[PDB]
Amino acid sequence: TDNTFVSGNCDVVIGIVNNTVYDPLQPELDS
Amino acid sequence: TDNTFVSGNCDVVIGIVNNTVYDPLQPELDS
């Protein structure tokens, strides 16, 4: 999430691909 | 907080206005 920005939806961009975007706040939830 | 930067106080800038700055970390800590 720090290296990318969320804009629009996935049905707009032409050629978009699916991949897992790492979120650094998720593993911190266990604290 | 990610789209803005914290500098100085509110008594310096001329024309500053009051609003609610959304912190994405609030729902993460509550969840």
DSSP B1-31: --S----S-TTTSTT--------THHHHHH-
A23 is written with which tokens? 């979120």
Tell me the nearest-neighbour CA distance from B26 into chain A, angstroms: 12
Resolution of this entry, Å: 3.2
Nearest to A2 by CA among A18, A25, A19, A20: A25
Q: List CB contacts (< 8 A) between A1 and chain B.
A: none
Tell me the nearest-neighbour CA distance from A17 into chain B, angstroms: 26
**Residues in chain A preceding a C-to-N separation beyond 2.5 angstroms (breaks):** none
Query: How far apart are alpha carbons A24 and A2 in whole angstroms?
Result: 9
